[PDB]
Amino acid sequence: GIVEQCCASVCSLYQLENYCN
Amino acid sequence: FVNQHLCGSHLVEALYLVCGERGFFYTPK
Ligand SMILES: [Cu+2]
């Protein structure tokens, strides 16, 4: 998932918004 | 904005920045 994606690859701040409440 | 390489505590910093008072879930494998 994103914890993996951001670290192993890259991610955007827009992808991170998906994890907001 | 630009793409991010974020591991460990640096990811949770970015989550905090993006979500703020909305709060967020940090859910690894
Ligand atoms: Cu560091």
Author numbering:
A (entry chain A): 1 to 21
B (entry chain B): 1 to 29
Sentences from the paper on this structure:
Hexameric insulin binds two metal ions by the coordination of three histidine residues (HisB10) to each of the two metal ions. In its natural form the metal is zinc, but insulin is also known to have affinity towards other transition metals, including Mn, Fe, Co, Ni, Cu and Cd, all in the +2 oxidation state. The coordination sphere for each metal site is thus completed by water molecules, some of which are weakly coordinated and easily exchanged.
Primary damage, i.e. photoreduction, was followed directly by XANES as a function of radiation dose, while secondary damage in the form of structural changes around the Cu atoms after exposure to different radiation doses was studied by crystallography using a laboratory diffractometer. Compared with the evolution of the electron density in the in-house crystal structures, the structural changes around copper in site II seem to be detectable at radiation doses of around 0.1 MGy and above. At 100 K, disruption of the water structure in Cu site II was detected at doses above 0.1 MGy. Thereby, the radiation damage to the water coordination could be initiated by the photoreduction of Cu2+ to Cu+. In the second water shell, the water molecule next to the coordinating water apparently moves away from the Cu site with increasing radiation dose.
